[PDB]
Amino acid sequence: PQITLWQRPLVTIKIGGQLKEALLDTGADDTVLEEMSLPGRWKPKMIGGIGGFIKVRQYDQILIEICGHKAIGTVLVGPTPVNIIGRNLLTQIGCTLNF
Amino acid sequence: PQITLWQRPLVTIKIGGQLKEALLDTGADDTVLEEMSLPGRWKPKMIGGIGGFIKVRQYDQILIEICGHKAIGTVLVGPTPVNIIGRNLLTQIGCTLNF
Ligand SMILES: CC[C@H](C)[C@H](NC(=O)[C@H](OCc1ccccc1)[C@H](O)[C@@H](O)[C@@H](OCc1ccccc1)C(=O)N[C@H](C(=O)NC)[C@@H](C)CC)C(=O)NC
């Protein structure tokens, strides 16, 4: 589809059998979701944005469905105020910026 | 043009007669640039991101050229890690997300 930017580009995602709302973020290198449980082993990681850094847990090879499109990649979980779909996953669904 | 996201969507912008590099960020409501000198009076604003909030100076009706497209709008200046072109200006140049 074609998403305009008059409003925040929020979409529905499916992860771990759960439905959630997330922001398509071209400014994010990584994908980070609010605190939740995921299977497998995780590694600690510090990610920084506007405001500073936060500590998150890194899970690899996680399957996520974005607007019906399946994608696989690293998903970080932590105290983020909003679920963010970053470039590592946006590329897998063929997302591009156009103007 | 069409910009893929395998790399950060960095573009060249022109403001105050100077060239700078900035990130096309669909996850940002506002446009924030690194510390610099702009004309006129400014108003205060607090903006929040991943690691918390930062204080910035708000300037209105600022001329900024993005990839050759001229836009005139609100620009924030503060301790941001990178120059960010947010939705307020992305809509002015007709930018959309597609997949
Ligand atoms: C998952 C974050 C990721 C690890 C990080 N990227 C960023 O922080 C991006 O910023 C560019 C950036 C790029 C590189 C280093 C630092 C900063 C991002 O798109 C922000 O812009 C945007 O974050 C999503 C968000 C939306 C609403 C509320 C809170 C957060 C955000 O903070 N939006 C604010 C917002 O819209 N708040 C409502 C806005 C005012 C900031 C200009 C990164 O890639 N680090 C290397």
List CB contacts of B46: < 8 A, sequence separation 6 or more.
B53, B54, B55, B56
Structure tokens at B81: 């890690």
In three-state form (DSSP H/G/I as H, E/B as E, the rest C), the secondary structure along A5-74 is CCCCCEEEEEECCEEEEEEECCCCCCCEECCCCCCCCCEEEEEEECCEEEEEEEEEEEEEEECCEEEEEE
Of A6, A27, A51, the CB nearest to B27: A27
Coil, strand or helix: which one is B91?
Answer: coil
- Across the A/B interface, how many CB contacts are shorter than 8 Å? 134
Helix (H) or strand (E) holding B90: helix B87-90
Cβ count near A53 (within 10 Å): 13
- Delimit the domains of chain A by residue range: 1-99
Contact criterion met (CB below 8 Å) for B95 and B51: no
Is A19 touching B (CB cutoff 8 A)? Answer: no
What single-letter DSSP state applies at residue B40?
S
Cβ(A57)–Cβ(B90) below 8 Å: no
Distance from C-alpha of A49 to C-alpha of B38, rounded to nearest angstrom: 24
Q: Which CATH superfamily is domain A1-99 in?
A: Acid Proteases (2.40.70.10)
